[PDB]
C-alpha cells in the first residue's frame, strides 16, 4: 500500500514532488527496495531551494534562485534518478518560474508605466531568461 505508492512526475508543481519524496522518506523511516530507492534519492531532496523562487519578488532574486536551483541539480552523479523524471522536474521549475513571472508582471503593470522603466525591468527579465 504505502510501499507501492507512486506519483506521475509530469503533473503537479515542483513543491508537490519535493513534498512527496520527502514525506515518503519520513513515512518509510516510521519495504527494502522502497527504502533503498528513497535513500538513493534523498541527497537531491534535502534542502531544495525553490522556496527562494516562491518567496522572490524582485527579478535578481529570481535569477539567483534559479542559479541556486541549477547548482543544486549537480548531484545527479550520486543518485540513480530517472532521466525523464528529471526532465519533468526541470519542466516543473519552468512552470512555477513562469507562474512567479506572471505574478511579478501583475505587480509591475507594464502597459500602465512609461517606456524607460518598462525597458529596464524587461531587460532584467530577459537577463533572467538568458541565465535560464
UniProtKB/Swiss-Prot annotation:
User: What does the UniProt entry say about where the protein is found?
Assistant: Cytoplasm, Cytoskeleton
**Top-level taxonomic group:** Eukaryota
Q: Which residues form the signal peptide?
A: none
How the protein assembles, per its UniProt entry? Answer: Homodimer. The cytoplasmic dynein 1 complex consists of two catalytic heavy chains (HCs) and a number of non-catalytic subunits presented by intermediate chains (ICs), light intermediate chains (LICs) and light chains (LCs); the composition seems to vary in respect to the IC, LIC and LC composition. The heavy chain homodimer serves as a scaffold for the probable homodimeric assembly of the respective non-catalytic subunits. The ICs and LICs bind directly to the HC dimer and dynein LCs assemble on the IC dimer. Interacts with DYNC1LI1; DYNC1LI1 and DYNC1LI2 bind mutually exclusive to DYNC1H1.
What disease is recorded for this protein? Charcot-Marie-Tooth disease, axonal, type 2O: An axonal form of Charcot-Marie-Tooth disease, a disorder of the peripheral nervous system, characterized by progressive weakness and atrophy, initially of the peroneal muscles and later of the distal muscles of the arms. Charcot-Marie-Tooth disease is classified in two main groups on the basis of electrophysiologic properties and histopathology: primary peripheral demyelinating neuropathies (designated CMT1 when they are dominantly inherited) and primary peripheral axonal neuropathies (CMT2). Cortical dysplasia, complex, with other brain malformations 13: An autosomal dominant disorder characterized by global developmental delay with impaired intellectual development. Some patients show signs of peripheral neuropathy, such as abnormal gait and hyporeflexia. CDCBM13 is associated with variable neuronal migration defects resulting in cortical malformations.
Role according to the record: Cytoplasmic dynein 1 acts as a motor for the intracellular retrograde motility of vesicles and organelles along microtubules. Dynein has ATPase activity; the force-producing power stroke is thought to occur on release of ADP. Plays a role in mitotic spindle assembly and metaphase plate congression.
For this chain, the family text in UniProt reads: Belongs to the dynein heavy chain family.
Domain commentary: Dynein heavy chains probably consist of an N-terminal stem (which binds cargo and interacts with other dynein components), and the head or motor domain. The motor contains six tandemly-linked AAA domains in the head, which form a ring. A stalk-like structure (formed by two of the coiled coil domains) protrudes between AAA 4 and AAA 5 and terminates in a microtubule-binding site. A seventh domain may also contribute to this ring; it is not clear whether the N-terminus or the C-terminus forms this extra domain.
The name this protein carries in UniProt is: Cytoplasmic dynein 1 heavy chain 1
In terms of the whole protein, what range is present? 258 to 423 of 4646
Amino acid at each position: 500500500k504505502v510501499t507501492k505508492l507512486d506519483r506521475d512526475p509530469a503533473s503537479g508543481t515542483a513543491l508537490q514532488e519535493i513534498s512527496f519524496w520527502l514525506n515518503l522518506e519520513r513515512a518509510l523511516y516510521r519495504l527494502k527496495q522502497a527504502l533503498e530507492t528513497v535513500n538513493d534519492y534523498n541527497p537531491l531532496m534535502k534542502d531544495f531551494p525553490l522556496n527562494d523562487l516562491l518567496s522572490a519578488t524582485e527579478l535578481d532574486k529570481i535569477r539567483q534562485a534559479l542559479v541556486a536551483i541549477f547548482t543544486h541539480l549537480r548531484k545527479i552523479r550520486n543518485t540513480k534518478y530517472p532521466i525523464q523524471r528529471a526532465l519533468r522536474l526541470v519542466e516543473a521549475i519552468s512552470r512555477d518560474l513562469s507562474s512567479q513571472l506572471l505574478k511579478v508582471l501583475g505587480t509591475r503593470k507594464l502597459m500602465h508605466v512609461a517606456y524607460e522603466e518598462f525597458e529596464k525591468v524587461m531587460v532584467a527579465c530577459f537577463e533572467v531568461f538568458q541565465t535560464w
